[PDB]
Design a protein around this ligand. Structure first.
Ligand code: NAG
Ligand code: NAG
Ligand code: NAG
Ligand code: NAG
Ligand code: NAG
Ligand code: NAG
Ligand code: NAG
Ligand code: NAG
Lengths: 494, 49, 48, 97
């Protein structure tokens, strides 16, 4: 069984006093006129999903509903919030309770507290570990279903339980119907009266007149046409395209090399025509540092490059800080310079247990220049020297210019769907639109096309060299044609 | 980019109908249609005024 | 004059305004939120 | 630390003072500061509400943390000041509005 939520399930969203104002708010409310599941207690206490949050309501004549259970398994295997109201004493506990196969009341704990004719409404939500309880009790004269009307709920309790709640169950007193409605992130307009009591409400996503009340900040709308929204078509599925290459990039040949070059004569290895899995380098605990100046290290798996170069050499530990864009010093200026617009990551680890002996084979002296009483000096690295120990540093320089990408990370491609609105990813380039066949003659060296706004106009599919046009999915202003609300609530939409 | 153009309320055809009405009025009733009713007048007499 | 005003407005989308890229998707696909937000604020200020 | 404007349970080491009504004062309520005249009010705060706010998001009223009564906050009198003067080639006497 299901019923109509109507206008029930709005609560005072904050401890801020307001009056005579049409204030607007976004919080997890019950959506207006949505369905709520209707349960019965005659001649029904199942476990329900909690989802993003719950409105709960019940109707009483004899105080049958006395409690709630919240958790994931509700079987003593996890912590579960228990609320019970027996006679005049409200009891709250969050123990790893052993609940019955079918919990009811007859007629490692982290918290404990002890204190139809009646409608008792509640709101439960679980935000960053905080279980927030709002409620309202009101007299009623109705047995069949939830009464229609409006009256908002105050917040009463906020329990810092830190419990992951996915399911909940109620507790009945056996010798009282109840409703369960899912909260959603719907913006509201709320009529605070002179006393500051919310006396009316308008759900924004209910219907086009309600959008118009949300747009004008008014419970009354004048005769006219109002631009409430922009209609935009949504995509269906994502499309991921990368060259179908299975070769793996030789990072091991750079990072696990028998010998590193000196900084005065640093090596520059080209990485191309391969799959670059950067999760290995990032997750590895062997590195003393992994600092990215270009892109974030976790994005490297999706993103891909025209080329990647690995600059490999040995420096003294205290000089690691100098290998960065914007830095100056005797190393940054004299022997190894990066562009100040450098894109990439600097990875380094000590070699105190490998290169140190003393080891005098390491000598030091524009961006990416190799400069092959003298300017030439060297180090004697010994195992007994931290800031004076040798470090192996590899600088990964990434070229992200829009051109055919030779280095693309470990991500599987999908099939391509034409003439449908889709979320696409071509060699790390993303966007949303309709991919169609085209007559745009890209030259063999061209990979991407562009519009006046510098947005992508067309792309060359990286697996099959054909050109696809990108046209954003149909969109436009909505407008609501309405007579005055003094004449009607009916509306028409452009 | 979100840049659109709205149509005018009065289409070119409707504007043409208004200029036609104003012109027909001017020719067959002089200025009387401006003040009140369009009162037919022989064009040559209208010019005399 | 109106055509010029719109063409100017559209061309401004190609400007960086101090950001690493004029393309919003390229910022988002490359930077984590704590850094992406800075680059985006630069574009928002310029575009607004 | 949760600094959301709500009743404070943990307050920093600092002695309170007496409260003076109907006079321009520099106030501090649970760490919330500003300048204004504190007066008696008829604003019925609900038991869970600690602060009230205006359209500008400025504080409209507060609940006194020691004695649970509501005080309205009216910013201290202010206004533009204009000087009415004949040109200085006639007189250096002025009137002030
Ligand atoms: C509510 O349930 C009825 C069936 O009783 C169904 O026809 C209606 O579409 C449902 N509405 C929503 C919003 O789920
Ligand atoms: C309510 O339950 C508690 C146990 O959680 C029990 O100690 C108490 O006696 C019960 N009821 C009353 C009215 O005290
Ligand atoms: C309490 O938690 C600990 C984990 O720190 C666990 O080993 C122990 O078995 C739990 N106690 C019970 C009664 O399950
Ligand atoms: C506010 O409360 C008073 C009772 O104190 C009541 O008479 C009035 O109708 C209520 N509504 C207003 C004025 O907001
Ligand atoms: C270097 O060798 C270690 C094994 O000792 C391995 O775990 C690591 O992934 C290798 N590094 C690279 C870049 O392949
Ligand atoms: C993609 O796979 C096809 C075989 O189905 C092959 O002919 C084509 O060359 C591959 N594309 C790339 C860029 O490797
Ligand atoms: C402040 O002190 C009074 C006694 O003068 C006491 O009754 C009141 O409860 C105290 N307020 C708080 C918030 O503790
Ligand atoms: C203004 O004052 C000057 C003296 O500095 C005098 O020469 C001039 O005539 C005066 N003009 C008027 C209009 O009073």
């Amino acid at each position: 069984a299901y019923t109509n939520s109507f206008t029930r399930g709005v609560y005072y969203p904050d401890k801020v006093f307001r009056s005579s104002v049409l204030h607007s708010t976004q919080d997890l409310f019950l959506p207006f006129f949505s369905n709520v599941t209707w349960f019965h207690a005659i001649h029904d206490n199942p476990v329900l999903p909690f989802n993003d949050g719950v409105y709960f309501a019940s109707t009483e004549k004899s105080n049958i509903i006395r409690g709630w259970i919240f958790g994931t398994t509700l079987d003593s295997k996890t912590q579960s919030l228990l609320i019970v109201n027996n006679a005049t004493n409200v009891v709250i506990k969050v123990c790893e309770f052993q609940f019955c196969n079918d919990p009811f009341l007859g007629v490692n704990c982290t918290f404990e507290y002890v204190s139809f004719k009646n409608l008792r409404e509640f709101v439960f939500k679980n935000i960053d570990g905080y279980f927030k309880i709002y409620s309202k009790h009101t007299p009623i004269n109705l047995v069949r279903d939830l009464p229609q009307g409006f009256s908002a709920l105050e917040p009463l309790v906020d329990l810092p339980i830190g419990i992951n709640i996915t399911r909940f169950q109620t507790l009945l007193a056996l010798h009282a119907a109840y409703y369960v409605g899912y909260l959603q992130p719907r913006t509201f307009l709320l009529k605070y009266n002179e006393n500051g009591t919310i006396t009316d409400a308008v759900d924004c996503a209910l219907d086009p007149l309600s959008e118009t009340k949300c747009t004008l900040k008014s419970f009354t709308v004048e005769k006219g046409i109002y631009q409430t929204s922009n209609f935009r078509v949504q995509p269906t599925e994502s499309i991921v395209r990368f060259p179908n290459i299975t070769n793996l990039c030789p990072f091991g040949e750079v990072f696990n090399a028998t010998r590193f070059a000196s900084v005065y004569a640093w090596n520059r290895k080209r990485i191309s025509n391969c799959v670059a899995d950067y999760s290995v380098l990032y997750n590895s605990a062997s590195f003393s540092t992994f600092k990215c100046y270009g892109v974030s290290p976790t994005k490297l798996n999706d993103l891909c490059f025209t080329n990647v170069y690995a600059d490999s050499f040995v420096i003294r530990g205290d000089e690691v800080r100098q290998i960065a864009p914007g830095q100056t010093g005797k190393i940054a200026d004299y022997n190894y310079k990066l562009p100040d617009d450098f894109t990439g990551c600097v990875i380094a680890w000590n070699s105190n247990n490998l290169d140190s002996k003393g080891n005098y084979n390491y000598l030091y002296r524009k961006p990416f220049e190799r400069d092959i009483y003298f300017p030439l000096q060297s180090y004697g690295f010994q195992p007994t020297n931290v800031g004076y120990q040798p470090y192996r540093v590899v600088v990964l320089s990434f070229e992200l210019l829009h051109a055919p990408a030779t280095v693309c990370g470990p991500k599987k491609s999908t099939n391509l769907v034409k003439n449908k609105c889709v979320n696409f990813n071509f060699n790390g380039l993303t966007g949303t639109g309709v991919l169609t066949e085209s007559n745009k003659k890209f030259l063999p060296f061209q990979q991407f096309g562009r519009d006046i706004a510098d947005t992508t106009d067309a792309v060359r599919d990286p697996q099959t060299l054909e050109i696809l046009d990108i046209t954003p999915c149909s969109f436009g202003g909505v407008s609501v044609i309405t007579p005055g609300t003094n004449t009607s609530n009916q509306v028409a939409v452009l | 980019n979100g840049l659109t153009v709205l149509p005018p309320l009065l289409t070119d055809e409707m504007i043409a109908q208004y200029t036609s009405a104003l012109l027909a009025g001017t020719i067959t009733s002089g200025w009387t249609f401006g003040a009140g009713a369009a009162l037919q007048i022989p064009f040559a007499m209208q010019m005399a005024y | 004059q109106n055509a010029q005003a719109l063409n100017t407005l559209v061309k401004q989308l190609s400007s960086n305004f101090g950001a690493i890229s004029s393309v919003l998707n390229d910022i988002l696909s490359r930077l984590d939120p704590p850094e992406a937000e800075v680059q985006i604020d630069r574009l928002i200020t310029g575009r607004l």
